[PDB]
Symmetry: D2
Subunit: 221 residues, 4 copies
């Protein structure tokens, strides 16, 4: 019973994208077992952001995933010690967004500390011109490599009727000893990250659902 | 109609991988509406293949996808003219495989003509040492870009307990005038590609099932 | 006297870029010791080319390099059997070009056979719109890997006052027994590829100079 | 004359590489006109470093570049305000090193502030096993893109007689208003970074030389 049906979240984020320094703080809630969560993010320095917050949204919670088919849950097994994630996202028009995150549990409150370095976003591109309209839903590929949980994803940024593709390369590291966890095998995480509200490039509300599953396609003989 | 619920397939492939010339021929069949098919392939020049056939298997059939949710079918709509596909697969240990394909229809035989270039596969990697154990199931991301259907994918090659990750960049081009197609929107194609039999690095048997669908995840308002 | 002060060149090139099939032929000559050479190219099929021939110029001659500082010449030592090259070129705006080449010798004719596959060039980019204006000079990084000579390069495509960057990944394979060659160590090859004339996307003249060298920077102790 | 034939350097570095947090501090001196400089680095937190310092070494000085051929010096023209640099470095065996740097001037001392995030370096690979033997010399490609100086590079990390290849993507931003500089054209920067001394994987001496120049190769008419 270390995680509850209803969890509080506090997030601190600091970074630079294309030389622009910013800091963000967020508060949220969700059901880790139902795989649902929302969050409110304030830009506290470098407002207004001169780039689409869409690139920061996936930096903002892997404890909140509905696990199907008895798939071992790397993230929840990691408490009370918690876990980190590190990701590089390559954008097909040239942006590169690297982030390192820390997850901790204090009573009922998950604590997120994120560092974000963004480089070579094209000045004319939809990130730096803030023309994006959110993410399509996605499916992460999750597999083990010596007690590290690995992530790969293809994500599509809405740019009117066009889609800008980026590529996620993620490592999830337990702060619990490897020998104390059941590692999952290869599996999938459906993720749907929605921006519900935004104001003056300084305030954002997010909503995310996540489900760990195997392929629904049957395997032949 | 034009496509029957039972189709035959003839494949001709020519290519070079790390300087090793090979030709293949396939004979196959499938229910294009059910999204199921199978294929026997003979390596007719350069057998025994000095690398894992696993890299060529996804070069061997996008007419055979079960479409859910009234998703327009780019492929089936393209007949009688048919379509081409072109792909680059990047392997995270350095291998690149580029292939162009032509799909034609005579009677109730789909004809595939495939050209393949493999470059910079590492000598001691599992493709060139032929130590792969087939593919995980996958989910392609499919989206229009002005008459062109685009595909992106993360696939996972089995190398024992480890997974070798590769990235698909696909373009699908109709030979029907773009005025005469209903383009789909952004969607996913589940793909499970199985190797049922291999012999002497010369004879292979493939089976594949594909479903076009939306995300299983509900959208909040 | 296998390789003369004056050598003739003949090239055969076949390929497809974004669906467009074409063949080209080249006739050339050079001094392979001076590292200078030229080539006339005619599109024999698929003329007029609907993309910049700029992407095909680097597929048109590594026998022609001035070697400084007693650097072992992998290419010249390969005769009479000769050598192959395989290259994938990734453009920062989405294009991939993959190519395999065979180089053989008969008397004083070098015979080039090239297969090219181009994928996912953006419809709106300078290559498919044919708005490029040739290559900056370049320096290739060349280093051995177990009998194979590897090449890495950043090249810059002129687009008025902008530069479209692409990345070369090249493997040079001798058809001569490894043990008959002195493999060079790590070194650079300065290449300047110039397009002297073009005519209705059908006829092209190239000149190229290549120099193999060490860094011109002193090493400290 | 803010800039003289002898300047001093102080560097602060903070980062995480594969989840290992560290800090370093640098003390150096140089002749920014002759393009020569040296730095002493102490690992001040998270010593002993459990990865190759060689990956941080190019995070430790673009003010120190001898400009030939009257090429405009973006770096020198950007004082007193100074400049930033942001780089992502992709290693062909999976590692990514993103970095943001601030360069300031306080009298005769250049002040470097570096944030570093490294993700997804292979546990088995020579970086996390600390088995690299320094860098080959390099040639950076430098070119303007509307007030930003872009850099691209291929660099080779020594691993015995093997070379591990990485790819630099750099943007240099003046903190001086863009319109107050003469932007250079496309040019090259020769860089030779040497580690002269290491101790206890907590103390390191770097020497570097840099020359800005055009191609050594002549242009035909």
């Amino acid at each position: 019973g270390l995680l509850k049906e209803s969890m509080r979240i506090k997030m601190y984020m600091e970074g630079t994208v294309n030389g622009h320094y910013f800091k963000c703080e967020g508060e949220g809630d969700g059901n880790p077992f139902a795989g649902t969560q929302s969050m409110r993010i304030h830009v506290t320095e470098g407002a207004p952001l001169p780039f689409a917050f869409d690139i920061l949204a996936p930096c903002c919670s892997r404890t909140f995933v509905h696990h199907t088919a008895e798939i071992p849950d790397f993230f929840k097994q990691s408490f009370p010690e918690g876990f980190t994630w590190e990701r590089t996202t390559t954008y097909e028009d040239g942006g590169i967004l690297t982030a390192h995150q820390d997850t901790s549990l204090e009573g009922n409150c998950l604590i997120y500390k994120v560092k974000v370095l963004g480089t070579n976003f094209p000045a004319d591109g939809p990130v730096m011109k803030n023309k994006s309209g959110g993410w399509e839903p996605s499916t992460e590929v999750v597999y083990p490599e010596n007690g590290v949980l690995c992530g790969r994803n293809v994500m599509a940024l809405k740019v009117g009727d066009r889609r800008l593709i980026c590529h996620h390369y993620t490592s999830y590291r337990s702060k619990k000893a490897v020998r104390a966890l059941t590692m999952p095998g290869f599996h999938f995480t459906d993720i749907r990250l929605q921006m519900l509200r935004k104001e003056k490039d300084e305030y954002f509300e997010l909503y995310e659902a996540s489900v760990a599953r195997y392929s629904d396609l049957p395997e032949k003989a």
